[PDB]
Write an enzyme that holds these catalytic residues in place. Structure first.
Site, PDB file in Angstrom:
ATOM      1  N   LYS A  54       0.795  -1.191   0.000  1.00  0.00           N
ATOM      2  CA  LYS A  54       0.000   0.000   0.000  1.00  0.00           C
ATOM      3  C   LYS A  54       0.848   1.271   0.000  1.00  0.00           C
ATOM      4  O   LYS A  54       2.009   1.247   0.383  1.00  0.00           O
ATOM      5  CB  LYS A  54      -0.967   0.055   1.201  1.00  0.00           C
ATOM      6  N   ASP A  58      -1.279  -2.386  10.312  1.00  0.00           N
ATOM      7  CA  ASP A  58      -1.465  -2.375   8.825  1.00  0.00           C
ATOM      8  C   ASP A  58      -2.110  -3.658   8.271  1.00  0.00           C
ATOM      9  O   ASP A  58      -2.426  -3.748   7.104  1.00  0.00           O
ATOM     10  CB  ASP A  58      -0.157  -2.092   8.107  1.00  0.00           C
TER      11      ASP A  58
END
Ligand SMILES: C[C@](O)(CO)[C@H](O)COP(=O)(O)OP(=O)(O)OC[C@H]1O[C@@H](n2ccc(N)nc2=O)[C@H](O)[C@@H]1O
Length: 301
Positions: free
Chosen positions: A13, A140
């Site tokens: 990401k 995350d």
């Protein structure tokens, strides 16, 4: 006995937007982030085995532990424990998310292990249990399960999904060495004590440009409140950001605490030329093209 194998693809990401609240006690900062999953991915293959084992292949994979200190290993243990089982699984990770690239590849692998085990053992534990396990594993992991684009509020609350009208085209460039996220928060705290660094507006305009699929609209809204601090600890990051734009990118930012610099481009052709120029110019160890948004951890076998 059982014998089949499941492979799960899971993306790295970038942060399109990151606002960082003033230091609390005990010392943490509340983060608001727009997460964006892009087409640099790992593929994680899980099979039944006599004992839990973990192996990784791909550039930089030899740097990574293959025991308990790997988040993908912890994910297998937690997923097995969740369903009262022994984690009797072997895990093979084809790594293409750049290692220590600051794209959260370890968290991606952990999320892919949850999904893969769910399917391999034919359980369908619900998405909400996977999210709860993801949150225990680390901050995350949940976004690696969610994928696409999401707005996150840093409060343990649910990610908000953002849909985009079209795909976006990025060049991602990686420095030869990353910075400690600790060092970057401390330097953020210091710069806010001695001056007034850039405070971002709220993220609504970012979301609206994403929704419009419009890179010219999104480019100037890209922002990261950790960037001034990263750039104070590693001044080469400023030249690198300039070179990407000189090479033809619309805008570039550092993603997170670094090493990713992310450059938004106008098109796939444009990203290929910006990437060729950057790669030629030597500001960065590794340069790659990607698109986003892409889906989060999913079975692909
Ligand atoms: C999630 C990120 O904030 C950005 O991607 C980072 O990866 C940091 O996560 P982390 O290192 O796992 O967080 P911890 O292990 O609790 O502590 C790392 C250090 O980074 C600083 N830190 C990290 C997260 C956060 N929101 N605010 C904090 O200021 C903390 O002071 C902490 O001492």
């Amino acid at each position: 006995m059982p014998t089949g194998s499941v492979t799960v693809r899971v993306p790295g990401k970038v942060n399109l937007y990151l606002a960082v609240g003033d230091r609390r006690e005990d010392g943490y900062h509340e983060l608001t982030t727009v997460f964006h999953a892009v087409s640099l991915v790992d593929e994680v293959t899980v099979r039944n085995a006599d004992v839990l084992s973990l192996e990784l292949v791909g550039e930089g994979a030899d740097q990574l532990p293959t025991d308990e200190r790997n988040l993908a290993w912890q994910a297998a243990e937690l997923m097995a424990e969740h369903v009262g089982r022994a984690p009797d699984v072997s895990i093979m990770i084809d790594k293409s998310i750049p290692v220590a690239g600051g794209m959260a590849g370890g968290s991606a692998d952990a999320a892919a292990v949850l999904v893969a085990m769910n399917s391999l053992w034919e359980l369908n534990v619900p998405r909400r249990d996977l999210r709860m396990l993801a949150a225990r594993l680390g901050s995350d992991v949940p976004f690696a399960l969610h994928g696409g684009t999401a707005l996150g509020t840093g409060r343990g609350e649910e990610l908000a999904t953002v849909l985009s009208r079209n795909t976006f085209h990025w060049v991602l460039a990686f420095a030869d060495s990353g910075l400690l996220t600790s060092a970057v928060y401390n330097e953020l705290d210091r710069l806010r004590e001695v001056g007034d660094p850039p405070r971002l507006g709220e993220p609504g305009p970012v979301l609206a440009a994403l929704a419009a699929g419009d890179p010219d609209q999104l480019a100037p809204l890209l922002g990261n409140e950790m960037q001034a601090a990263a750039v104070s600890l590693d001044p080469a990051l400023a030249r690198a950001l300039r070179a990407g734009v000189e090479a033809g990118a619309l805008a570039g930012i550092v993603s997170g605490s670094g090493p990713t610099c992310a450059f938004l481009c106008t098109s796939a052709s444009s990203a290929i030329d910006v990437g060729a120029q950057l790669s030629g110019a030597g500001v960065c160890r590794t340069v790659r093209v990607a698109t986003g948004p892409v889906p989060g951890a999913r079975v692909v076998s």
